[PDB]
Amino acid sequence: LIVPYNLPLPGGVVPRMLITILGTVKPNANRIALDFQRGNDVAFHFNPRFNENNRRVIVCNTKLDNNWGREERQSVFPFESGKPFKIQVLVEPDHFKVAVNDAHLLQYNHRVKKLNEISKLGISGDIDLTSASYTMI
């Protein structure tokens, strides 16, 4: 698939919706981003950073009216440059639940409350993208 990639989420997200992204991190990657969007707002920005002051960190945030909110940071970093990955995002009633390569990574409490209006997923950054899909579990 071409990156950046836009995956429509028809009628928004709902609990029990599982989104699966398969790809490979490019060699010498710098960043990856998944952006769950409600129009121009970003309900959930998931942003692995491969070199922030020589550390690897995952940053999560929400953008409302073009302004970023309080960052939530995770030091557990399951991505490796050059290697294939699977990201699964499970929508639960109170949070997005993220697993990478079948291991739980983090939860992100819903800041944007109108789940039915979060109708696009943007995928960008330093990856080769193989597949992006969703199903109900």
Ligand SMILES: OC[C@H]1O[C@@H](S[C@@H]2O[C@H](CO)[C@H](O)[C@H](n3cc(-c4ccsc4)nn3)[C@H]2O)[C@H](O)[C@@H](n2cc(-c3ccsc3)nn2)[C@H]1O
């Ligand atoms: O909050 C998320 C946003 O962060 C900003 S960078 C942000 O800048 C601030 C000053 O304006 C602070 O410096 C902030 N900070 C917070 C901390 C901190 C927090 C706790 S200890 C240290 N140390 N830096 C730092 O993260 C990125 O630019 C945004 N971004 C990424 C992308 C993208 C596109 C394609 S792939 C990625 N498109 N927009 C997005 O990730």
Ligand SMILES: [Cl-]
């Ligand atoms: Cl809302």
